[PDB]
Design an enzyme around this catalytic site. Structure first.
Site, mmCIF file in Angstrom:
data_model
loop_
_atom_site.group_PDB
_atom_site.id
_atom_site.type_symbol
_atom_site.label_atom_id
_atom_site.label_comp_id
_atom_site.label_asym_id
_atom_site.label_seq_id
_atom_site.Cartn_x
_atom_site.Cartn_y
_atom_site.Cartn_z
ATOM 1 N N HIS A 3 0.824 -1.245 0.000
ATOM 2 C CA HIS A 3 0.000 0.000 0.000
ATOM 3 C C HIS A 3 0.847 1.279 0.000
ATOM 4 O O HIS A 3 0.350 2.299 -0.470
ATOM 5 C CB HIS A 3 -0.923 0.008 1.212
ATOM 6 C CG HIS A 3 -1.664 -1.275 1.363
ATOM 7 N ND1 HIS A 3 -2.633 -1.682 0.453
ATOM 8 C CD2 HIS A 3 -1.602 -2.229 2.314
ATOM 9 C CE1 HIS A 3 -3.136 -2.837 0.850
ATOM 10 N NE2 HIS A 3 -2.509 -3.192 1.983
ATOM 11 N N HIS A 61 5.590 7.163 6.440
ATOM 12 C CA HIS A 61 5.315 6.645 5.095
ATOM 13 C C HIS A 61 4.782 7.805 4.266
ATOM 14 O O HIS A 61 4.585 8.907 4.794
ATOM 15 C CB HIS A 61 4.289 5.513 5.179
ATOM 16 C CG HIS A 61 2.997 5.991 5.733
ATOM 17 N ND1 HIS A 61 2.702 5.960 7.066
ATOM 18 C CD2 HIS A 61 1.942 6.548 5.110
ATOM 19 C CE1 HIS A 61 1.505 6.509 7.254
ATOM 20 N NE2 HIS A 61 1.004 6.858 6.062
ATOM 21 N N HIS A 118 2.086 9.019 0.775
ATOM 22 C CA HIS A 118 1.024 8.831 -0.235
ATOM 23 C C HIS A 118 1.409 9.704 -1.419
ATOM 24 O O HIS A 118 1.860 10.828 -1.187
ATOM 25 C CB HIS A 118 -0.357 9.195 0.323
ATOM 26 C CG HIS A 118 -0.681 8.504 1.605
ATOM 27 N ND1 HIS A 118 -1.463 7.370 1.653
ATOM 28 C CD2 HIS A 118 -0.329 8.781 2.869
ATOM 29 C CE1 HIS A 118 -1.557 6.980 2.919
ATOM 30 N NE2 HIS A 118 -0.867 7.821 3.676
ATOM 31 N N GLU A 175 -3.392 13.383 0.489
ATOM 32 C CA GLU A 175 -4.676 12.931 1.057
ATOM 33 C C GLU A 175 -5.442 14.154 1.544
ATOM 34 O O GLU A 175 -6.542 14.388 1.073
ATOM 35 C CB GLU A 175 -4.375 11.932 2.171
ATOM 36 C CG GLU A 175 -3.645 10.711 1.652
ATOM 37 C CD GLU A 175 -3.945 9.494 2.479
ATOM 38 O OE1 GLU A 175 -3.632 9.480 3.684
ATOM 39 O OE2 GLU A 175 -4.532 8.551 1.892
ATOM 40 N N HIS A 214 3.472 11.184 6.186
ATOM 41 C CA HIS A 214 2.820 10.939 7.486
ATOM 42 C C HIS A 214 3.830 10.369 8.461
ATOM 43 O O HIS A 214 4.344 9.269 8.230
ATOM 44 C CB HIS A 214 1.648 9.980 7.324
ATOM 45 C CG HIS A 214 0.512 10.587 6.600
ATOM 46 N ND1 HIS A 214 -0.500 9.851 6.006
ATOM 47 C CD2 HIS A 214 0.255 11.887 6.351
ATOM 48 C CE1 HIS A 214 -1.339 10.696 5.438
ATOM 49 N NE2 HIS A 214 -0.911 11.937 5.639
ATOM 50 N N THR A 272 -6.197 6.741 7.469
ATOM 51 C CA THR A 272 -6.684 6.951 6.092
ATOM 52 C C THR A 272 -6.629 5.667 5.268
ATOM 53 O O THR A 272 -6.996 5.729 4.092
ATOM 54 C CB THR A 272 -5.910 8.061 5.388
ATOM 55 O OG1 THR A 272 -4.597 7.553 5.146
ATOM 56 C CG2 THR A 272 -5.915 9.364 6.166
#
Ligand SMILES: CC(=O)[C@H]1CC[C@H]2[C@@H]3CC[C@H]4C[C@H](OS(N)(=O)=O)CC[C@]4(C)[C@H]3CC[C@]12C
Ligand SMILES: [Zn+2]
Length: 257
Positions: free
Chosen positions: A61, A91, A93, A103, A116, A195
């Site tokens: 992910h 990590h 996104h 996000e 994050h 999230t």
């Protein structure tokens, strides 16, 4: 089963995780003109001098850098928080192109990526217990825009070739997460959620106003990661972001005027 695709992405998550339609889901659009300056909010305390990074992991992910959270070595305190939160991991996104990937959004603006830094409240003793509490986690969110390189990110970018596919991990010691922070700790804060599944409503969100700049070459390396395991059809790890969720009965507070 869950992912970011047409058949398993964010619009499907509520079937396995009904809290997806809950009262404090993340991320959200940050309406900068509606956020209330709160002069009672304290400066954020980021104490990362004794941070001990352990490993870097592709979980199918995102990728994450994990820290030793067995002691108060890398802690977040102050700002909107009561007590001490230990750094577990960071990590990202990111998008398939620079105009999407974050996000959180700011006045509907999407950034190329969002960092994050995940922390958990030491009063609950372990992160598994903390995710069951409304004040269990504090996630520090940092926007990435594309321009000049972030030198402090390069050590991360350079090992991603070694964790291309889901399940792969590597030693990742002596990484200093202070090299990922912008100058200003001015922030927005609101009560929200993880999230990704399980979308637990356990997070105090602290989203920094100032983005960091990363280079096109740095974010291109994020986009070479794979969602798939080695030997499965290659599916680029891109667009691993949940879109903005309804704010419902929440107030976003600003630390700054
Ligand atoms: C159900 C669990 O065991 C929890 C305990 C720690 C949780 C993890 C804490 C770190 C967050 C980061 C992350 O959330 S985010 N994007 O809100 O910061 C993805 C979910 C994940 C991996 C969580 C997944 C659910 C976990 C494993
Ligand atoms: Zn995240």
């Amino acid at each position: 089963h869950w992912g970011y695709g047409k058949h398993n992405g964010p619009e499907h998550w509520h079937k396995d995780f009904p809290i997806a339609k809950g009262e404090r889901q993340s991320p959200v659009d940050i309406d900068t003109h509606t956020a209330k300056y709160d002069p009672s909010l304290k400066p954020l305390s980021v104490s990362y001098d004794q941070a001990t990074s352990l490993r870097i992991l592709n979980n199918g992910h995102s990728f994450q850098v994990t820290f030793d959270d067995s002691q108060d070595k890398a802690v977040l305190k102050g700002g909107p928080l009561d007590g001490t939160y230990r750094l577990l991991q960071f990590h990202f996104h990111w998008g398939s192109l620079d105009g999407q990937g974050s996000e959180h959004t700011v006045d509907k603006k999407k950034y190329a990526a969002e960092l994050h830094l995940v922390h958990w409240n030491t009063k609950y003793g372990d992160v598994g217990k903390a995710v069951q509490q409304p004040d269990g986690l504090a996630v520090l969110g940092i926007f990435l825009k594309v321009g000049s390189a972030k030198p402090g990110l390069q050590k991360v970018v350079d090992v991603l070739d070694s964790i291309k596919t889901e399940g792969k991990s590597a030693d990742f010691t002596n990484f200093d997460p202070r090299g990922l922070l912008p100058e200003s700790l001015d922030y927005w804060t609101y009560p929200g959620s993880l999230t990704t599944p399980p979308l637990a409503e356990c997070v105090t969100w602290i989203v920094l106003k100032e983005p960091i700049s990363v280079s096109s070459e740095q974010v291109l390396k994020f986009r070479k990661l794979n969602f798939n395991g080695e030997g499965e059809p290659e599916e680029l790890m891109v667009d691993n972001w949940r879109p903005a969720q309804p704010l419902k009965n929440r107030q976003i507070k600003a630390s700054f005027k």
